[PDB]
Ligand binder design. Structure first.
Ligand SMILES: [Zn+2]
Lengths: 533, 235, 92, 196, 55
């Protein structure tokens, strides 16, 4: 009976006295945690060992029994430093003991503190556990209460105030609860023996350790290794977790502004795109315009005006990979697609369902297609709606839904389908032996102007900050050029759907300078670059 | 089944989802999958040897490789060595084959010295020693390139690209160069040599260039072999 | 699965007779082809794996396409049978 | 004011408001709360009441749903349907809107209880805002079970009020009627409306 | 705390055909292919507590 008091006294004196140099680090941490309504304490094992090794020995022998005592000691200290009501505090641990590989845990480790690491592969939803709980006695209508703690309980049968064999029920109207969550840990990929599928474990956490990690992240874990009921005399193992380890600044935008006022920025950005590829100036310019894009607009009568850009390319393999790397968001695919959804979408079967291809998935970003001619039959017709409307709509087999397809498409191949694109060009080649020799020398080196990341961040900044408008002079220029070309064709087609593309190219060109208005300088370069032919 | 092939050899004797799995397998060296919220990864890390029947009953030599297969271009691009084997007509070859076949058939009949004579006539190396040798070489030997002759390799690569473009052939690529260097390392490993040598590069160049030539149409084949004589036969 | 033996298992070290082979579905012709290639049968499903021996010789009957043989054409043209299966009969 | 993702154990027994999409609806069922009986000999009408955990905010001993057949004084009883009282009951499920789902993660949802007037005012696919008391239920495995009590308690929202969300209809005010009638007497209303 | 003796080269062999009721509680030597394998679990050793591995 007295041992429960001495241990609590010992941990209470541990928190109140541990200085390293001049700061009571744990008194300060426990005060600073309460002010932000965080009821927990993060103790370090090495400091506990340094203070008194006997306390660590007791903790190491019987963790399941001794952890609650230290927690209630934390509560007793927490009340003194902040009151002249609080819940029970959560203890959290850090350690540097030798990691056990997940594959080696066995019957020798049951009810021991264990440190391991792996990859999280799944996460459950949150669930409720009880800590303080009230009880009603059915016969006499007497009432009492119980305090649960979550370490390895059932309702009692010692009736009070005969009173009967099993008279107790719960008043949920006057009880307290906490959160709980389940996780799955899979062993590290570079530790598995050859020819075997990786092994995994299941584990639990509660209160502040919940909702701290997501699937696919590599983590390190400290926790008690134990068993639970779910052959003969055989039980399942698991782990109780006690600890886990896993927009612009001003100085950034100053650099981007300095770039914006450079008189030769357009040349600089074109030169920075696929520098190994020789020639093909207008291709690089068109890719800059594709990356930057126009400006979206919405009108009083509800009509909606597109912002995206679309380009086709008729060597060519490299540029799509570069566009994938430089773009803020990017998807890469070949014409047949990743599944039966193809590029756009399809219905599959047993009840029917629907899944989207690599036009729905790239919504909000860029998508590049490696061979546009290998497009499937359904996608040939569906890309019309995917490009013009930026939507995909299906009414089949009782399904009736519409999907968003807001993206800019880059494509390459080697007909009427060319009408959907804003610009079309044909790739050109040159055959200097020095170029091939340089490439070969670089290949042997691995076998034996603006950088990508800076350019990507700059593109993000320009997309976020500016959305320019046409000046009146540009309007007069464009309308005169439009009627001029149509008259020239008449005496010898251009249509409104291409004028509205020239406008988007003009806005994208004005976007680089961060000029709020587009000007005749941009209109001239726009119509100059319009010569797809 | 690629998990079971980890650091081993994968064998395919005949041939959409299977091909899709093989596309991902050749593109990567690791396999990844997700299901009902779960996410996980696996390793393939293996050599793939495959065989196929050329689009029905018989191969057509007048046409390029793509006409004779049910494969996408990246498959042919990413494999190191490609080859076609055909039942050619020759009286002497037929006689040699028939004599060897009946001789082996008699040699296998159910009805120590006999075994030793049989074994030593069968092969020049005892295959137990060869298997141990292969295991030893795979575990111990890790060759490296020598930097002198690589200037010549770059010049040969540029020349091959120029000649390919000149006749209008599909061009040679960095994949072919990488395959040449890797095959040269394999030749060095086969004799337990930690150094690649000029003859290794020559043999690798011959293998890859001949494989590249076999994929082409007949007129392109004739032009290539007439120009490439200083590689396929000479060096 | 029910595992219970099929016809080819009962004909182990025996003669298996197939009548009107040409009416068999391709999806089952391939199964007979796979068994005939190896003289072996494999099962792997529902956590149960098994391998079995099928040293059986096959005797087959078939109809020419259109019901009457065409002397103008090869046997491949007359018969609705895929080439790998046709390659594995000793005698026609 | 919350959403299904963020509803947390701290909020139990509080009055909360949630927003989401209806995904499932149960069939409507009747529920007994009171029964009336006529004693054959004495001519006296008797009655009794019933309770269940979802019927009351406060907690009471559950009732066995048995009809009494015999009086305290031994008289045989008869049940008077039509004088007894039954009420309607329906359960639904509400899920967080897909626009708020993070990182392609699994979405989360809550079950709601409706009764009396609130029944059948929603269908699947409706965007809806629900007001009610957030409460727990059951023994949670502390009544003896094989789980070692790792499983948690069950929880619900008891529907107090339901409002739709517009994501079509409008209701006119008097000024709209005046303007609509006045505009109709222009000479060329058809041209104005068509060109608009 | 405890050591196990492993016996080797037992001089008689059965397949899974020849086993009969007379073999019960006798030592046997058997060969075959492993078709299926469970995961490893702990098992209570004595019926203070001790465990052992099981499969
Ligand atoms: Zn009592």
């Amino acid at each position: 009976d007295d041992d429960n008091t001495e241990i609590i006294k010992s941990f209470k004196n541990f928190i109140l006295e541990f200085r390293l140099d001049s700061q009571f680090i744990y008194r300060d941490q426990l005060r600073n945690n309460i002010l932000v309504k965080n009821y927990s304490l993060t103790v370090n094992m090495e400091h506990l060992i340094g203070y008194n090794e006997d306390i660590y020995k007791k903790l190491s022998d019987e963790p399941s029994d001794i952890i609650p005592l230290f927690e209630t000691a934390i509560t007793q200290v927490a009340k003194r430093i902040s009151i002249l009501s609080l819940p029970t505090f959560q203890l959290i641990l850090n350690s540097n003991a030798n990691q056990i590989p997940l594959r080696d845990l066995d019957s020798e480790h049951v009810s021991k503190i264990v440190r391991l690491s792996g990859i999280i592969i799944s996460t459950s939803v949150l669930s409720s556990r009880a800590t303080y709980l009230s009880i009603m006695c059915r016969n006499c209508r007497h009432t009492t209460s119980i305090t649960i703690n979550n370490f390895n309980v059932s309702l009692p049968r010692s009736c009070l105030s005969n009173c009967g064999p099993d008279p107790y029920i719960i008043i949920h109207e006057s009880s307290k609860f906490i959160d709980q969550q389940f996780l799955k840990l899979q062993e590290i990929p570079e530790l598995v023996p050859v020819g075997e599928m990786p092994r995994n474990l299941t584990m639990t956490c509660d209160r502040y350790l919940t909702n701290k990690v997501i699937p696919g992240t590599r983590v390190t874990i400290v926790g008690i290794y134990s068993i639970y009921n779910s052959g003969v005399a055989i039980r399942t193992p698991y782990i109780k977790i006690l600890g886990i380890q896993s927009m612009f600044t001003e100085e950034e935008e100053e650099e981007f502004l300095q770039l914006s006022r450079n008189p030769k920025l357009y040349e600089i950005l074109t030169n920075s795109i696929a520098p190994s590829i020789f020639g093909n100036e207008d291709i690089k310019k068109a890719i800059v315009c594709l990356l930057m894009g126009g400006s979206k607009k919405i009108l009083p009568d509800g009509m909606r005006l597109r912002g995206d850009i679309n380009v086709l390319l008729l060597a060519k393999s490299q540029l799509l990979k570069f566009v994938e790397k430089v773009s803020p968001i990017a998807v890469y695919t070949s014409g047949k697609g990743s599944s039966a959804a193809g590029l756009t979408a399809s219905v599959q079967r047993r009840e029917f369902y629907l899944e989207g291809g690599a036009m729905v998935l790239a919504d909000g970003g860029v998508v590049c297609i490696d061979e546009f001619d290998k497009m499937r039959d359904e996608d040939r017709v569906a890309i019309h709606e995917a490009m013009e409307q930026q939507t995909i709509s299906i009414a089949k087999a009782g399904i009736t839904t519409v999907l968003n397809s807001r993206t800019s498409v880059l494509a390459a191949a080697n007909t009427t389908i060319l009408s959907r694109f804003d610009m079309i060009f044909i790739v050109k080649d040159d055959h200097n032996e020095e170029r091939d020799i340089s490439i070969a020398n670089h290949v042997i080196n691995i076998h034996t102007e603006i950088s990508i990341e800076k350019m990507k961040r700059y593109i993000t900044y320009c997309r976020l900050k500016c959305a320019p408008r046409l000046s009146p002079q540009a309007a007069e220029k464009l309308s005169s050029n439009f009627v001029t070309i149509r008259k020239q064709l008449l005496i010898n087609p251009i249509t409104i759907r291409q004028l509205e593309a020239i406008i988007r190219i003009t806005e994208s060109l004005a976007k680089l300078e961060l000029s709020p208005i587009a000007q005749e300088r941009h209109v001239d370069e726009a119509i100059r670059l319009f010569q797809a032919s | 089944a690629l998990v079971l092939a980890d650091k081993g050899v994968c064998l395919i004797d005949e041939f959409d989802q299977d091909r899709t799995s093989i596309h991902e397998a050749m593109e990567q060296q690791s396999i990844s999958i997700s299901k009902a919220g779960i996410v996980t990864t696996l390793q393939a890390r293996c050599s793939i040897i495959a065989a196929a029947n050329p689009n029905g009953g018989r191969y057509n030599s007048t046409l390029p490789l793509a006409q004779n297969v049910s494969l996408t271009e990246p498959i042919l691009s990413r494999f190191d060595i490609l080859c076609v084997v055909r039942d050619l007509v020759d009286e002497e070859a037929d006689e040699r084959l028939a004599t060897f076949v009946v001789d082996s058939h008699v040699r296998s009949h159910p009805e120590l010295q006999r075994q030793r004579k049989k074994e030593e006539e069968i092969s020049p190396i005892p295959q137990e020693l060869l298997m141990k040798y292969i295991h030893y070489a795979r575990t111990k030997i890790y060759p490296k390139l020598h930097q002198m002759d690589m200037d010549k390799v770059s010049r040969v690569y540029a020349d091959l690209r120029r000649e390919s473009i000149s006749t209008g052939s599909f061009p040679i690529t960095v994949r072919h160069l990488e395959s040449i260097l890797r095959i040269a390392e394999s030749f060095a490993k086969m004799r337990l040599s930690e150094f690649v040598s000029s003859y290794d590069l020559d043999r690798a160049i011959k293998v890859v260039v001949d494989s590249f030539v076999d994929a082409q149409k007949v007129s392109v084949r004739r032009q290539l072999r007439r120009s490439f004589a200083i590689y396929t036969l000479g060096h | 699965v029910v595992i219970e033996a099929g016809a080819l298992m009962l004909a182990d070290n025996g003669i298996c007779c197939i009548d009107e082979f040409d009416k068999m579905d391709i999806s089952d012709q391939v199964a007979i082809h796979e068994a005939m290639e190896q003289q072996t049968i494999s099962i792997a499903k529902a956590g149960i794996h098994a391998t079995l021996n099928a040293r059986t010789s096959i005797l087959a009957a078939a109809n020419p396409v259109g019901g009457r043989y065409n002397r103008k054409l090869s046997l491949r043209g007359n018969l609705n049978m895929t080439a790998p299966i046709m390659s594995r009969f000793d005698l026609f | 004011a919350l959403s299904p993702r963020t509803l947390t154990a701290q909020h139990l027994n509080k009055l909360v408001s949630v927003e989401g999409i209806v995904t499932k609806t149960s069939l409507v069922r009747p529920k007994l709360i009171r029964s009336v009986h006529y004693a054959a000999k004495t001519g006296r009408f008797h009655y009794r009441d019933y309770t269940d955990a979802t019927t009351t905010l406060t907690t009471r001993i559950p009732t066995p749903a048995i009809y009494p057949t015999e009086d305290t004084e031994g008289n045989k009883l008869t049940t008077e349907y039509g004088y007894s009282t039954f009420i309607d009951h329906q359960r639904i499920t509400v899920q967080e809107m897909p626009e708020m789902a993070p990182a392609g993660q699994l979405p989360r949802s809550i079950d709601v209880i409706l009764d009396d007037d609130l029944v059948d005012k929603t269908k699947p696919g409706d965007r809806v805002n629900v007001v009610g008391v957030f409460k727990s239920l059951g023994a949670g495995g502390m009544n003896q079970s094989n789980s070692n009590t790792l499983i948690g308690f069950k929880t619900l929202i008891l529907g107090n009020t339901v409002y739709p969300l517009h994501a079509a209809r409008q209701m006119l005010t008097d000024f709209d009627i005046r303007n609509i009638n006045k505009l109709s007497k222009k000479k060329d209303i058809f041209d104005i409306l068509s060109q608009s | 705390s405890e050591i196990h003796v492993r016996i080797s080269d037992f001089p008689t062999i059965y397949s899974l055909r020849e086993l009969r009721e007379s073999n019960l509680s006798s030592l046997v030597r058997v060969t075959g292919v492993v078709t299926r394998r469970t995961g490893v679990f702990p098992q209570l050793k004595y019926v203070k507590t001790v465990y052992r591995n099981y499969q």
